[PDB]
Amino acid sequence: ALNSINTNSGALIALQNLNSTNAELTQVQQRINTGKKIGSAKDNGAIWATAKNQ
Amino acid sequence: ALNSINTNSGALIALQNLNSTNAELTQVQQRINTGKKIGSAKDNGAIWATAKNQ
């Protein structure tokens, strides 16, 4: 509703945006820790496989 | 009658109108308490059932 006490749709959207920021922060921490932008097959499978074979 | 001591038709109508106001007040109290305009199947069965399934 517009003046609801049971549902806070604005808080749900704010939670989604905070989760997006936290996921970006986790990615940057992995890059700082490994020194790699592609550190596993999850980052980019084709380039990861090429680098492994090379 | 017009000047009767046994029957007060005006008091009967006034009682009916007071009962109408009391029923409206009970409905508003339920909305304030639950935070819901449709809080049970008695308020609106189709919309209540849709909201339950969703």
From Swiss-Prot, chains A, B:
Its localization reads: Secreted; Bacterial flagellum
- State which residue ranges cross the membrane: none
Q: How does this polypeptide assemble, per the annotation?
A: In C.crescentus, the flagellar filament is composed of multiple flagellins of 29 kDa; 27 kDa and 25 kDa.
What's this protein's function?
Answer: Flagellin is the subunit protein which polymerizes to form the filaments of bacterial flagella.
**Family the entry assigns:** Belongs to the bacterial flagellin family.
Q: What is this protein called?
A: Flagellin FljN
Q: Which organism is it from?
A: Caulobacter vibrioides (strain ATCC 19089 / CIP 103742 / CB 15)
Q: Which residues of the full protein are shown?
A: 2 to 55 of 273
